[PDB]
């Protein structure tokens, strides 16, 4: 999980993704790929072999041909990199990558996370807060805020 290593790879991604404008498409490619990577019986086999060509070919081969030429030459980069083993991490990055542009999500307050796409901190946020009306759900909230205020409280008891 170097994953920081992602960037030069990961970075050119968005750019190619930007340039190639695939991100719908490229996004597809990534979905497909992480899928491919996931394959465990394959995985045992996956570090098996020395010849990079062999893997580009075989991997690309059973793949179901979701591949792109830019992603062929480039996949050839990751294998030539030999680093390719860990690739799926980038999708996470890619997510943020995709996310980066214009996105937003949410952290559950005490219940469940809206992940609302709201780009104004504490504003678009506030918009969601007010937007409750989702005010209904408990979902452990009370134990949480009462226990957390209670936590600041006993914290002061200690302070007392």
């Amino acid at each position: 999980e170097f994953i920081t290593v992602a960037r030069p790879y990961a970075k050119a991604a968005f750019d190619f993704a930007v340039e190639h404008q695939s991100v719908e498409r490229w996004q597809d490619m990534l979905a497909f790929a992480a899928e491919v990577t996931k394959n465990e019986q394959m995985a045992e086999l996956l570090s098996g072999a020395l010849a990079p060509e062999t893997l580009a070919e075989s991997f690309i081969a059973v793949a179901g041909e979701q591949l792109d030429e830019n992603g062929q030459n480039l996949i050839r980069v990751m294998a030539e990199n030999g680093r390719l083993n860990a690739l799926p991490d980038v999708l996470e990055q890619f997510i943020h990558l995709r996310a980066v542009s214009e996105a937003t999500a949410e952290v559950d307050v005490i219940s469940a996370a809206a992940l609302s796409e709201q780009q104004l901190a504490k504003i678009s946020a506030a918009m969601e807060k007010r937007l409750s009306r989702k005010v209904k759900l408990n979902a452990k909230i009370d134990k949480s805020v009462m226990a957390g205020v209670i936590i600041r409280a006993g914290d002061m008891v200690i302070d007392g």
């Binding site: 899928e35 491919v36 394959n39 019986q41 394959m42 045992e44 086999l45 570090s47 020395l50 075989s58 081969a61 059973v62 793949a63 179901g64």
Partner: protein, 74 residues
């Protein structure tokens, strides 16, 4: 598309296409690379610490340690 687990079948399919090659047995492997009588070493994964390892030109081979990824023999 493959959505859930149709991928697996796709995988199966994807596999099935290329499927043939995969896996091996404990006691079964191949010595990948070596120098100096010590070998990058593969297969036969579960074995007792330092069991005697039949060699071709038969002999046992001295077993140093079990690395997680792969190990080599003495």
């Amino acid at each position: 598309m493959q959505l859930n687990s149709t991928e697996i079948s796709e995988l199966i399919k994807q596999r099935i296409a290329q499927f043939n090659v995969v896996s091996e047995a404990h006691n079964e492997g191949t010595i990948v690379s070596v120098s100096d009588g010590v070998i990058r070493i593969h297969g036969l994964a579960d074995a007792m610490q330092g069991e005697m390892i039949s060699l071709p030109g038969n002999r046992y081979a001295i077993a140093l340690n079990l690395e997680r990824d792969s190990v080599g023999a003495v």
